[PDB]
Design a protein around this ligand. Structure first.
Ligand code: CL
Ligand code: CL
Ligand code: CL
Ligand code: CL
Ligand code: CL
Ligand code: CL
Ligand code: MN
Ligand code: MN
Ligand code: MN
Ligand code: MN
Lengths: 381, 381
């Protein structure tokens, strides 16, 4: 078919970069992060919507792999919060090991340049995002270390309120958008060069974040509220504020977010959502954010990671231009990452102060006096 | 003076690389890791044996900065262990910020090549080590992420027994050397390319580690048992096993480890310890491991980081050759790091299996059956 031949050409010319895939959590569920001698299964998985053979088959150019861990359920909130931090390091560890053990397929990327170099070499650009600020255990120091471990976006919440922002699905509201700590964290996220992800956050938290952020943000996996009213989808108000922000809405394949009856959801519905956003806020502010492996079953025609060529072909069939399809595929999210890094370099170049954690005093006045007395003795020498 | 002129030449030709300095913990004590607008104090500190002016003055070529946090004291052992992990990320964070905010003085290094490039550029090669396996919260995943954050040695214990090994200063013995987990961790440390540090560990733990390790190890800050009997010093038995291991003993300036009466300890005593080791196991297996800022007061003549030229001059005065002084200064620890990286590349190249954490099951049989049923449905399409 001419249209399928065109879709294949686009997928080789420009990387399709998906905003969110939970394959690392499936590895934790199935293998418990022990992938030694499991290549036969990693290439052909007995569960889930992602494996390394189907990943090649769908011609995906890049992927933000999710380092998600669940919201803490422990009655002791200090334990649960700290447990989430350790689990985050476990998920970052298995992602890095997955990439390093399969270097012909996957190549780690943390920038626009590293995405392109991976794509030129014929590998899936493998980026990392965490899904919720519960994962950092109220530590901005930990967050900067997660950035150093390769995390390039942070979803502000998952399905739980945290100290920084409100989640969409939980009620009643705690902060009513962002907290004062949340507002201050937006500045730090912009300064360090971390992409803000507004998926899973409340409508009011999106509005506040979209006005406050000095860099473009993303929705890593959210769809359109006007087509399907859901707390997880993006309102027309926030779509416009995303345009002013210069951000990108990466459209989700979650059936609940595409149709009132989940079993009615299709590839056509995903294309409707992409075209709605592209028509109203321009095709330079729309992306693809599957949420593959964050669901049991996908829409008809988008059952797994092998189905991306049907999405590219489907967009071309509806009359979206090649250049606009290339934008939706990956150029837009590359631009956002590039601009986030530019803003960070600008703010770091200007010598902006970093956000520090509130630490306990480890020395009393007796120890501090001993140290100052000792220093003075050394000055006498 | 001719000898001081010779010492200055050696310090410009070859980097003096110190094995252990706790300046990052002094920053946590004094500033609580908030160094914004504190450059005047960071260059001229009101406390401690390290600041950026005195660091330049002593002509130090490189430094393993300690990311130490105390042994957990919480009655709830799960909380205390997880707290230590978060505190470790705080200390790694402040070390990276200290380096990044002072790029004319400090440059991050994690390899032999990066040490030399830093030294050619006229900067202190800034490496990182953690002091105790209590810092990883029983997580090998976390340990691999610490390696990715720039940690290049791990002291197996501090002043507390952990799940892997026995500390020197604590009695009674728990494991009687290394545990079974400890033995297995030695293989993983060798595989990932992490230097094993045997300072603070028991004599029996040293003996077992020195026989088991496939890469050379270090003592980041330990002195000689035969000259001064202390649990923290290295016995003649372990000195010989260090020779077979190809490791390096980096001699400590702790007054308690140099003399029976601490107030009698001197620069001359440090030189006696270096010459003892150099005479008996060769000058290619001896280094300098101050432990500056791990003590209130240092020996007479080694009061702070500005005093390294007196140590180099003192060694030359005693009849140690230029080439052997250059070895003790830094070439030896560079060799150990280089060999640790070579062994890791060899084992990783051969496809050796990594040590994985014991994780809980997150899915029950009902969820796993749903996933396999779903996968089969996709295979039918
Ligand atoms: Cl290009
Ligand atoms: Cl699921
Ligand atoms: Cl704290
Ligand atoms: Cl060289
Ligand atoms: Cl102290
Ligand atoms: Cl666990
Ligand atoms: Mn997810
Ligand atoms: Mn999600
Ligand atoms: Mn120390
Ligand atoms: Mn110590």
């Amino acid at each position: 078919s001419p249209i399928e031949e065109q879709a294949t050409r686009l997928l080789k010319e420009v990387p399709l970069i998906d905003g969110h895939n939970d394959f690392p959590y499936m590895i934790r569920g199935w293998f418990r992060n022990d992938i030694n001698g499991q290549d036969a299964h990693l290439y052909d998985m007995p569960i889930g919507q992602t494996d390394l053979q189907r990943l090649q088959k769908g011609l995906l150019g890049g992927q933000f792999w999710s380092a998600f861990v669940p919201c803490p359920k422990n009655p002791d909130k200090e334990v649960g919060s700290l447990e989430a931090l350790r689990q985050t390091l476990q998920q970052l560890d298995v992602i890095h090991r997955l990439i390093e053990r399969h270097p012909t397929i996957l190549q780690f990327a943390d920038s626009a340049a590293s995405i392109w170099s991976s794509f030129r070499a014929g590998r899936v650009a493998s980026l990392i995002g965490i899904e919720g600020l519960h994962q950092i255990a109220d530590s901005v120091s930990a967050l900067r270390m997660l950035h150093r471990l390769g995390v390039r976006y942070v979803t502000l919440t998952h399905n739980c309120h945290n100290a920084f922002a409100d989640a969409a699905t939980v009620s009643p509201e705690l902060h009513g958008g962002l907290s004062r700590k949340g507002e201050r964290l937006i500045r730090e996220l912009n300064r360090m060069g971390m992409m803000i992800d507004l998926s899973h956050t409340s409508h009011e938290a999106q509005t506040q974040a979209l006005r406050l952020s000095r860099a473009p943000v993303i929705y890593s996996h959210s769809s359109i509220y006007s087509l399907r009213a859901h707390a997880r989808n993006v309102t027309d108000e926030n779509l416009h504020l995303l345009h002013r922000n210069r951000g990108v809405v990466m459209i989700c394949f979650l059936r609940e977010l595409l149709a009132s009856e989940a079993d009615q959801a299709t590839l056509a519905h995903v294309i409707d959502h992409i075209i709605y956003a592209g028509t109203r806020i321009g095709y330079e502010h729309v992306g693809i954010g599957s949420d593959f492996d964050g669901m049991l079953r996908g829409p008809d025609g988008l059952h797994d990671v092998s189905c991306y060529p049907a999405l590219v072909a489907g967009l071309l069939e509806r009359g979206v231009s090649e250049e606009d399809v290339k934008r939706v595929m990956g150029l837009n999210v590359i631009r956002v990452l590039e601009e986030v890094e530019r803003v960070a370099a600008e703010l770091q170049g200007a010598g902006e102060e970093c956000l520090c954690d509130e630490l306990d005093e480890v020395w009393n006045e007796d120890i501090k006096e001993q140290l100052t007395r000792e220093r003075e003795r050394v000055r006498k020498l």
